[PDB]
Design a protein around this ligand. Structure first.
Ligand SMILES: *[C@@H]1O[C@H](CO)[C@@H](O[C@@H]2O[C@H](CO)[C@@H](O[C@@H]3O[C@H](CO)[C@@H](O)[C@H](O[C@H]4O[C@H](CO)[C@@H](O)[C@H](O)[C@@H]4O)[C@@H]3O)[C@H](O)[C@H]2NC(C)=O)[C@H](O)[C@H]1NC(C)=O
Ligand SMILES: *[C@@H]1O[C@H](CO)[C@@H](O[C@@H]2O[C@H](CO)[C@@H](O[C@@H]3O[C@H](CO)[C@@H](O)[C@H](O[C@H]4O[C@H](CO)[C@@H](O)[C@H](O)[C@@H]4O)[C@@H]3O)[C@H](O)[C@H]2NC(C)=O)[C@H](O)[C@H]1NC(C)=O
Ligand SMILES: *[C@@H]1O[C@H](CO)[C@@H](O[C@@H]2O[C@H](CO)[C@@H](O[C@@H]3O[C@H](CO[C@H]4O[C@H](CO)[C@@H](O)[C@H](O)[C@@H]4O)[C@@H](O)[C@H](O)[C@@H]3O)[C@H](O)[C@H]2NC(C)=O)[C@H](O)[C@H]1NC(C)=O
Ligand SMILES: *[C@@H]1O[C@H](CO)[C@@H](O)[C@H](O)[C@H]1NC(C)=O
Ligand SMILES: *[C@@H]1O[C@H](CO)[C@@H](O)[C@H](O)[C@H]1NC(C)=O
Ligand SMILES: *[C@@H]1O[C@H](CO)[C@@H](O)[C@H](O)[C@H]1NC(C)=O
Lengths: 176, 357, 123, 123, 355, 176, 128, 412
């Protein structure tokens, strides 16, 4: 179950390889067997989904046997399984996409509580340990509440998505 | 139990052979399609000796055909040589899994010339013959009750169109809908109309003729389905603009006609807003092309609508079929469905009825 | 002279007999010469195919003959079934599918049996 | 094909001895293409006719043999004379007349001979 | 007695199939004759093969020969291609005794002045066939020929249309010959072949005392069939359409019809013939009429030799009178190919070699 | 033997029959075996008879299988049997002609005898049944003596002369 | 049409390689320069080659049926195998001698060789 | 026992036909086949002697036949030879001639017209009727492939060291020969085929003085000659006969430019190979044209239908121990050294520029001067060698797959 995590608004890459190198018909199906994207000859047709503008494919590599699917401006509901059937195999790919951001815009002072928002996706077992390089190796779930705001409480380190021994990186917006 | 060897018995076998085209090219027209026909195509057969075969059961598979791919390549050669892209951009885009990769631009001679698609028959070479099953109830796979051997197929126009097949063949009995595997989606729908649907393009589709054909196709679908979950035509799915729009070339100019209005009927005269774009993506191969601005002359194009392409959608009620296209192989499949190359082999193998040592 | 085609889907036994005696203005000249040559190619190709077939039958040890029998066994793995029913309700076209995967095999075995027969006759 | 009748008018024995061995600008452009097509169609017709005759002789078992003996006996119930008288007094030209009334039996024995040879090979 | 098969025995049976034309057409001539020849014929073989046959007798019947029908149909096609009548009438008279007006259809065609020059033509049997040729000079037209010889392509025939006088080919070998289906019956035509040609010149005139000598030879041959009494007489042509009444023929230019009263006015115990070019003809190819353009102003001269005669004797009641009236062109083509027969090779047999 | 009858100067249409419908050489002969009319290919020839200027055939009908013989201005001395020779038939037809005239065109009185002239063909047996509109079916020889002239004597007569049950309408000049 | 072949390797080595080869053998007109008629002419040349090939094959087959082979690639006769002509060791003329030069060594008297072969078949004829 | 199907070739003779890509130089020959098949033949050593080879003999026959066919179509000038009253007009050596037709003036060179008795006349017009060169036709060389009819194969020897004789390592079967340039050239070859980097010399008998020596250089050398002549052309009736016209400007002898360095280096390779053939110790020399009949003495070639005789005796003479060059032109003709009619080529209007590459050269060894000097005077005049040089690698063969070979067999 290969899985990727996006930044919930960034451009993420999903590829299924065809070792035959022929640029043949392919499509993309979701967990509900709804078409989302594929080719027809040498063109690109987007399936009738809710991600038509949101996702697209890299046409240039079709001749060389690579048929990807690239989604831009990601969001929480995009987290679902996808399938390639380039000749007959049903190569599956798992996608669990969600981001972590802040909610306390300006009402913050010395000692007040800050709030964090995590898009918890249904049907997953994650453990968020988003940290900073300046010294905030904080452990928390949804809300990131700290009693004191020192110099070691800001920045962005490698976010530990921790979904089946896989790690990614994305941004945390806090500056001092 | 000793086998013998009989000779001269009638035995056919499927095979792949190179085919030669027989187009009736006048050869005295400046239009490039005709001069190409003189360039690589022979003239048509003077008299076709079609031999009917009776009591023959032949498993026809219209999707596992060879003529479709051969004529695919040949028509690519047509479109490259005739309608030369005077600005053509193609990704050579060499590999080294991600790799940055390049696009090359080629300039050419760039004349604005009318494209007249005279029929291009395809004839099998010496030693092989093509088989056509003349049953009007072919469902795309299985035995064809009546089969006849011929040397040259019926004249095909090398039309290039999306979401609407133009200048194509006509079904005899019913407006047939054919798919290789209908039980699940992602496989195209090919429709053949009994009656041509006239269209007018200038720089309109006659109602009460398209509507009855839609009634016929929904009747055929409910025949294939369980008479419930009524099929209704809907918007184009989306993606590349060419597949979402009725794209066709006549007179050297690319016309992209929005067809949402005609696919806006729910089943239990109309004018089309056509447009012209200088930038295209060739059906032949991945890339983009830039062409000269259109000529000032008003272009009147009248072409029969003969075929229609749909796509199914997965469900957990009413069916919605989205216009499809862009796979020109499927386009000429709709016209060359009833054809199959075959090679004859008189040699055979026998039962045990002998003892001679 | 060719006998390329013959009876249609029928009892292969009856067709076994049928073959025996079955067959054994100009407006523009450029249209004629390029099309007549194709049919002439077809005829000469059929003639060459017949000669090749007769040559192969000869190297099998029976040239010229139309119903050639020689000593060679019907292997059980070659889709063995009741001979009578193949004779009644089976035709050459349909029966071609059932023996396609064994055709090269039977050709080879008939060939080496012919080689053995001629070797034993010579020695 | 017209060479054979050179031996006509000779005694059947000498005729068969001979039968043992018989053959052992636009002006140029149009000359090459259409004249060639017709001239070559004639040759193809010749070879096809010869192949048909060779095939017909082959069905009887005597493939590629100018002279051969088949195991079926001569139909003697109908009137026929002695062998020595046959081979000497007459010649091949009027020998077609003696069997012209046998033409039906001709069509019989021509098929009957092959039936005998195939019944011997099958038995 | 055991039946044994032989391949290649010299056996033939008479039978007709389509023969193929062979003409040394130049193909660079605008005259429609060479155009038709190059369109629907093949070049003659450089080495025609003729094997003589010995101790063989075959029965030839030129009158019931059917290759002549093939040649007549082919020349009808040739005339339809070459001479295009620019006024053409053809009776239809569809019948459900002058029941209807039977109005003639009035096809009008192009009217070009194309030269019509005869060229030698050969007929060759298709492969698997033979064309017997009787070399005997005493062949009286019907019956056995003591000597025969096989050749695939007959001697070059010039297809020449003419009434009352054959010309431009088919010279007799040894003696003047008389041929007829039934010499006693009046209706059947009598073909006469000349041993020596008499030159005839017609201009926009025949050599006398050579015509007289050939006529004397002809009357001698006729008396050989008759009882040497009943002195032969020639007179006014019988009467009818202009084409049969007078010598009709064409040579490059427009066909013309020439009075032959001077030619046939002698009773046997330089001659100038008035000739008139006409544009109104009765088509020999099929029943009907045609009109042609006026002839070219340039002087047209034709040189030919009268190698043949067609005569019909008068009815019996004394003396015998012969008049020239040969119009059915099948007769002209029977004269040229009187000695050729199509035959099929059947090289198989049965013999009692006792194994 | 079919027999046709003439009116001494009218037209007569003798008919052959082509069993093949091919327009093959035929010849019209007389009882003395002298040629009158003949086909030669597609032309038409006339033999040396007494009808060379008189004989004629409707040429157009040959191709449909009809070979008529027309003898305009028929005269009594020309009454003879004629024979077709279409392919092998000797179809024999006979033509008989006799003219009824009046030697006294106007020399006649009321009750004066009248003389009729029947130029019969020699060697024939006519049966002169003059069917006269007075009700007098006269059975007489060459002449008919009318002993009375009445006002009813006008009108053209029809002297139907039978010969082996061969009848044909007749228009003789009797006008008053 | 078996007259077409180019493999000539067995010559130096054993002839038997040629025996395997023969057994294995047993089993667009651009009109820019009027290329249409040109293609017809070249097709005529090629088809003439094919018909001359089949005619040559039949010409050889008639002669081969004059002897007791009639189509068999590997014939068998009862004539003496050399011992009177090219009396060289069988091993060297079957395993070392090049096929072409061997055929020249034979064509020294190949006509009389054919004559003796015909005599052999004649003797086999009416053996009874 | 017989072995049918075996590949055997007997060297034969067959009449090859044209393959060309009004002018008689390009007559109605067959077009060159589109996909000339070529099959290599491994381990095949084919004996060759292109001096005695059957292909060279039959190719001489075909070449002679085609030249005979190709000469006739042009019209003739049989009766025009009459007495001519002419006056002479770097000596120009041009004579203006008048002949009494009711007098007409034409221009002839000194060499084409000799004195008769001032009074002048053609050399052999009375003896051999002169033929006019057709203005429509042009004398141009084009590549002419040779194709064998059906039933015959063409063998090609692809060996650099071939020399045209002896065994050849690699051979191939080809349907149509490579393009042959029919070029008229004496003691020299123009625009022929480029040869191998090593220089080949070929001779029927190296020791024999009678047999010519033919040498093919590795690298083509430029030979372009120009005749700066502004001539005109006249319509003089015999029927409108068309002859030389008046002259404007000054005449120049056609000067040919050759690079001295590359010519010297090519003949240096040549003398190296000649030392190989005749002994390195022997000293080799070169001399001018030997002499004899005027045509064979000088190099004879044609450009623009006009024949220039390069008797540049200095060029062939290269004395050794082992630039612009002037030439004449001629209007009277003896082509293929035929004793029959002599055709006449009138001049073409405008300058004549001829550009070509030197590809070969022919000499004749002097009789032996033994081991002291080996003079190789330029020899030629036989048109056989020019076509002979171009196709040294080609031969004709027939197939006779009817091998007989002694194997043990008893059977019945
Ligand atoms: C499908 O079949 C239809 C026919 O049923 C076919 O339509 C044809 O298209 C051609 C191409 O345009 C039409 O040809 C035109 O004819 C007119 C009148 O002769 C010409 O003037 C046109 O050429 C000029 O066009 C410009 C004027 O706007 C000029 O400026 C320019 O210089 C050209 O010279 C043009 O050739 C033809 O009339 C129709 N036939 C019909 C409508 O019946 C169609 O192309 C086929 N294919 C498709 C994809 O529809
Ligand atoms: C029988 O055979 C003789 C063989 O001589 C043959 O005679 C030829 O007849 C023609 C027509 O009468 C003769 O007339 C002319 O000959 C010249 C020179 O060859 C041609 O140029 C002529 O052709 C043109 O003539 C017109 C001149 O203005 C053109 O307008 C016209 O369109 C023609 O193109 C014409 O042939 C001819 O000389 C003789 N001789 C030969 C050798 O041709 C005769 O026709 C044959 N048939 C019969 C029934 O006699
Ligand atoms: C072509 O026509 C075919 C008709 O024969 C169509 O058949 C399709 O076959 C597939 C088989 O892969 C069906 O998919 C299901 O497969 C499961 C397999 O068992 C378990 O696997 C999945 C996980 O992989 C799991 O989710 C399941 O719940 C199971 O635990 C079967 O159990 C299902 O019953 C079913 O077979 C398709 O459903 C079936 N199509 C249809 C319409 O039923 C094929 O779809 C056609 N293809 C195209 C492109 O048209
Ligand atoms: C077509 O008909 C055959 C007949 O048995 C059937 O097997 C096949 O499934 C059908 N295909 C479709 C697409 O309906
Ligand atoms: C007779 O005329 C022909 C023309 O058809 C001519 O060739 C021939 O020389 C003439 N003379 C003789 C004796 O045939
Ligand atoms: C002959 O022609 C030349 C060149 O045109 C001219 O210079 C010369 O004067 C002419 N000769 C005579 C005698 O006119």
């Amino acid at each position: 179950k290969k899985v990727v995590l996006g930044k919930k608004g960034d451009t993420v890459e999903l590829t299924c390889t065809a070792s035959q190198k022929k640029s043949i018909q392919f499509h993309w199906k979701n967990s509900n067997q709804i078409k989302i994207l594929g080719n027809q000859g040498s063109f690109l047709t987007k399936g009738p989904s809710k991600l038509n503008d949101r996702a697209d494919s890299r046409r240039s590599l079709w001749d060389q046997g690579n048929f990807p699917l690239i989604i831009k401006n990601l969001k929480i509901e995009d987290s679902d399984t996808y399938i390639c059937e380039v000749e007959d195999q049903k190569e599956e790919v798992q996608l669990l996409v969600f981001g972590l951001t802040a909610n306390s815009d300006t009402h913050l002072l010395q000692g007040q509580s800050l709030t964090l928002t995590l898009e918890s996706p249904p049907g997953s077992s994650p453990s968020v340990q988003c940290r900073s390089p300046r010294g905030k190796n904080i452990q928390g779930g949804k809300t990131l509440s700290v009693s004191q705001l020192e110099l070691q409480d800001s920045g962005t380190w490698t976010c530990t998505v921790l979904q089946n021994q896989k790690k990614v990186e994305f941004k945390i917006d806090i500056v001092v | 139990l000793w086998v013998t060897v009989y000779y001269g018995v009638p035995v056919w076998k499927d095979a792949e052979t190179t085919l030669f085209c027989a187009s009736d090219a006048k050869a005295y027209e400046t239009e490039k399609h005709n001069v190409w026909a003189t360039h690589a195509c022979v003239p048509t057969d003077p008299n076709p000796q079609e031999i009917h075969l009776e009591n023959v059961t032949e498993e026809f598979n219209m999707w596992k055909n060879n003529m479709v791919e051969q004529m695919h390549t040949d028509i690519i050669s047509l479109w490259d040589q005739s309608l030369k892209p005077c600005v053509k951009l193609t990704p050579l885009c060499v590999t080294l899994r991600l790799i940055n990769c390049n696009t090359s631009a080629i300039t050419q001679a760039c004349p604005k010339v009318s494209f007249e698609p005279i029929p291009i028959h395809y004839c099998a070479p010496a030693g092989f013959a093509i088989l056509k099953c003349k049953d009007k109830k072919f469902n795309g796979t299985g035995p064809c009750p009546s089969v006849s051997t011929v040397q040259c197929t019926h004249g095909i126009k090398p039309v290039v169109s999306t979401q609407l097949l133009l200048n194509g063949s006509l079904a005899e009995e019913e407006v047939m809908i054919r798919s290789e595997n209908i039980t699940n989606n992602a496989k195209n729908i090919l429709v053949q109309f009994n009656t041509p649907v006239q269209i007018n393009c200038t720089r309109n589709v006659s109602k009460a003729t398209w509507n009855e054909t839609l009634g016929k196709v929904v009747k055929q679908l409910r025949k294939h389905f369980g008479n419930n979950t009524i099929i209704r035509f809907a918007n184009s799915s989306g993606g590349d603009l060419e597949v979402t729009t009725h794209s066709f070339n006549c007179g050297g100019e690319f016309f992209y006609c929005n067809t949402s209005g005609l696919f806006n009927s729910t089943w239990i005269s109309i004018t089309l807003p056509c447009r012209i774009k200088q930038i295209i993506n060739m059906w032949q191969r991945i890339g983009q092309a830039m062409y000269a601005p259109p000529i000032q002359g008003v272009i009147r194009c009248v072409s029969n609508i003969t075929g229609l392409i749909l796509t199914r959608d997965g469900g957990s009620t009413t069916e919605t079929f989205r216009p499809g296209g862009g796979d020109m192989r499927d386009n000429w499949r709709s016209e060359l469905y009833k054809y199959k190359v075959v090679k004859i082999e008189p040699l055979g193998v026998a039962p045990t009825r002998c003892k001679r040592r | 002279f060719l006998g390329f085609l013959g009876a249609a889907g029928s009892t292969m036994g009856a067709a076994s007999m049928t073959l025996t005696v079955q067959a054994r203005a100009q407006q523009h000249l450029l249209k004629l010469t390029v099309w007549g040559i194709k049919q002439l190619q077809a005829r000469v190709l059929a003639v060459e195919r017949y000669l090749r077939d007769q040559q192969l039958l000869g190297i099998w040890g029976c040239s010229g003959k139309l119903i050639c029998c020689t000593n060679v066994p019907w292997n059980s793995s070659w889709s063995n079934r009741n001979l009578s029913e193949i004779w009644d309700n089976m035709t050459w076209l349909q029966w071609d599918k059932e023996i396609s995967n064994y055709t090269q095999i039977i050709y080879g075995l008939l060939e080496e049996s012919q080689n053995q027969q001629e070797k034993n006759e010579q020695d």
